[PDB]
Design a protein around this ligand. Structure first.
Ligand SMILES: *[C@@H]1O[C@H](CO)[C@@H](O)[C@H](O)[C@H]1NC(C)=O
Ligand SMILES: *[C@@H]1O[C@H](CO)[C@@H](O)[C@H](O)[C@H]1NC(C)=O
Ligand SMILES: *[C@@H]1O[C@H](CO)[C@@H](O)[C@H](O)[C@H]1NC(C)=O
Ligand SMILES: *[C@@H]1O[C@H](CO)[C@@H](O)[C@H](O)[C@H]1NC(C)=O
Ligand SMILES: *[C@@H]1O[C@H](CO)[C@@H](O)[C@H](O)[C@H]1NC(C)=O
Ligand SMILES: *[C@@H]1O[C@H](CO)[C@@H](O)[C@H](O)[C@H]1NC(C)=O
Ligand SMILES: [Cl-]
Ligand SMILES: [Cl-]
Ligand code: NA
Lengths: 189, 342
């Protein structure tokens, strides 16, 4: 998955998330065209496949001809009451996209972290099933303790949680951040 | 650089692609032209993540009409697909049967018809160059290549571009994509119709069916990107947030933030370990409640989600969930009422 955020000079904006699903999608590459084909059918629920221990199939998300599979993607644009763009934000990282996107927004809009900090700040994730709270390696350990004494079982992600790209309007203009977890970098004028 | 820009900004997950988007802006392109141009580049530099073999959504805001729209160009199950086609994760994840009908190119075309200022061909030009000349493998792709070393190395068609002496490329080594370059060129000149009802179409169908898939020409001919003129929105303070509804996760996001807005978080919320700990606990509980409701979501054309989404975007409903968040403890799964039917 890749997330992209754009603000133009006229204040117009695009938030765009795109995916072939898993790494190299289906692993089917055309030798003639070079096109690498998605494995998006894997985002449907299937009655014969158990993913998580104790998690049943979701009938709302079964395969039907012509149907689109449920997605965690959430490309977002925040606009001010005055009609000016305030934030352009989204993420990659499967079911972690939605929590990561919420965090970027919370971090900037409520905690008052600038966009780079909002993107780099350690994240965490809980999706109810499974019954575990995943934290990034460098999370404030007062957070870990606050969760554990409240009975959350926590575990540390072996890599990182999601990948966020964001732009936020500031005093100095448009501040942009690409997530160092994947190594992108912004560009502008 | 600090990356604060006076006039325009592109944030992508590869530097070269952010620059390509920025250059399109600088040459007079709309926000959409820059995004399309950047996306064609990410399809190359992060070939493992996205590209013309997949699908996307665009949330687009016009600062003149002050209207937001969404473009739905996510893949669709082929006409021959059915509920019980797979019996193992392996069947749904690997090979042609795992392939859904790609929407990406129809999605660029629709966004561009509505918002483009640069010519279609100009959007592809710098990516055509990049794929022919090559680029150093970046950090993300290097990691993906490592992760999937086994399958890559044993499949000749993938090792063809993704290996160096039968071994997966590593960070800093040159990756070239000469067939995609040709394909991007065709797309640039012949237009989207080349993919869906044109010179690329039969080849696509043949690649997918050779690997055991069931996508046919009719599937491609039939694919349509969709304009959504009324995206989901929620109100936060003086701001509105535009995001896609089902089949994407706007409703999940909306519910997370609506639950949380009632706590009135501020920089104080994180100033002491006492407050910070409670704050993050509250966050995690809102995640839990929000994902409980997510299992009802699905393609709104096949599933009636009108009221599921009404609830998830409703502040009162979020207030009802916020009141079940205990400040001193988390709860067992059933506390959050995850539902699998209605
Ligand atoms: C799985 O099982 C169903 C029902 O027996 C059958 O229709 C289908 O073709 C099988 N698919 C695969 C990929 O094994
Ligand atoms: C926004 O709307 C204006 C006026 O209708 C139009 O000229 C312009 O093309 C639109 N901007 C974008 C980025 O599509
Ligand atoms: C192009 O379009 C028509 C129907 O839309 C179809 O009959 C024809 O075979 C298509 N051509 C290709 C190459 O898919
Ligand atoms: C938010 O939701 C719906 C869109 O159909 C509508 O009630 C309202 O006009 C929307 N708000 C904005 C600012 O578009
Ligand atoms: C929506 O939430 C209400 C509680 O506010 C509940 O009674 C109702 O069952 C829900 N409706 C749907 C369609 O899920
Ligand atoms: C899940 O974790 C919570 C948090 O401690 C715990 O109360 C519960 O017993 C666990 N199991 C289930 C099925 O919810
Ligand atoms: Cl990304
Ligand atoms: Cl190639
Ligand atoms: Na930055």
């Amino acid at each position: 998955t890749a997330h992209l955020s754009v603000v133009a000079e006229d204040g117009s904006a695009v938030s765009a998330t795109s995916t072939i699903n898993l790494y190299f999608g289906s692993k089917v590459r055309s030798p003639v065209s070079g096109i690498l084909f998605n494995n998006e059918m894997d985002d449907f629920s299937s009655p014969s496949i158990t993913n998580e221990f104790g998690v049943p199939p979701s009938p709302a998300n079964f395969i039907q001809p012509g149907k689109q599979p449920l997605s965690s993607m959430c490309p977002t644009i925040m606009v001010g009451q005055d009609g000016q763009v305030r934030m352009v934000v989204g993420a990659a990282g499967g079911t972690q996209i939605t929590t990561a996107t919420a965090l970027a927004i919370i971090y900037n809009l409520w905690f008052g972290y600038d966009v780079k900090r909002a993107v780099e700040e350690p994240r965490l994730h809980n999706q109810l099933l499974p019954n575990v709270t995943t934290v990034e390696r460098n999370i404030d350990q007062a957070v870990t303790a606050a969760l554990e004494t409240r009975h959350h079982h926590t575990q540390i992600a072996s890599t990182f949680i999601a990948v966020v790209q964001a732009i936020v309007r500031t005093a100095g203009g448009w501040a942009a951040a690409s997530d160092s977890r994947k190594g992108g970098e912004p560009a502008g004028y | 650089d600090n990356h604060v820009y006076t006039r325009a900004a592109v944030a992508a997950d590869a530097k070269q692609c952010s620059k390509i988007g920025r250059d399109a802006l600088r040459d007079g392109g709309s926000a959409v032209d820059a995004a399309i141009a950047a996306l064609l580049c990410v399809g190359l530099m992060n070939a493992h993540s996205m590209g013309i073999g997949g699908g996307l959504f665009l949330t687009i805001y016009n600062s003149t009409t002050r209207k937001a729209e969404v473009i739905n160009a996510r893949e669709v199950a082929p006409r021959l697909a059915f509920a019980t086609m797979f019996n193992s994760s392996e069947q749904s994840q690997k090979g042609g049967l795992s392939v859904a009908v790609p929407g990406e190119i129809r999605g660029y075309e629709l966004a561009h018809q509505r918002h483009g200022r640069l010519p279609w061909a100009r959007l592809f030009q710098p990516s055509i160059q990049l794929a022919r000349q090559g680029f150093p493998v970046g950090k993300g792709l290097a990691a993906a290549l490592e992760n999937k070393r086994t399958v890559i190395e044993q499949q000749p068609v993938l090792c063809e571009v993704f290996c160096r002496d039968r071994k997966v490329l590593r960070e800093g080594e040159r990756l070239t994509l000469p067939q995609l370059a040709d394909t991007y060129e065709t797309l640039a000149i012949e237009g989207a119709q080349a993919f869906y009802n044109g010179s690329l179409t039969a080849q696509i169908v043949k690649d997918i069916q050779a690997a055991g898939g069931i996508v046919t020409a009719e599937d491609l001919n039939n694919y349509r990107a969709e304009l959504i003129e009324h995206p989901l929105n929620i109100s936060l303070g003086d701001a509105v947030l535009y995001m896609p509804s089902a089949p994407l996760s706007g409703p999940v996001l909306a519910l997370i933030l609506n639950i949380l807005k009632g706590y009135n978080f501020s920089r104080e919320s994180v100033e002491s370990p006492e407050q910070k700990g409670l704050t993050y606990h509250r966050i995690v509980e809102a995640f839990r409640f929000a994902y409980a409701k997510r299992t009802l979501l699905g393609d709104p054309k096949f599933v009636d989600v009108t009221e599921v989404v009404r609830n998830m975007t409703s502040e009162f409903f979020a207030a009802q969930l916020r009141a079940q968040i205990s400040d001193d403890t988390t709860h067992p799964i059933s506390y959050y009422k995850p539902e699998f039917y209605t």
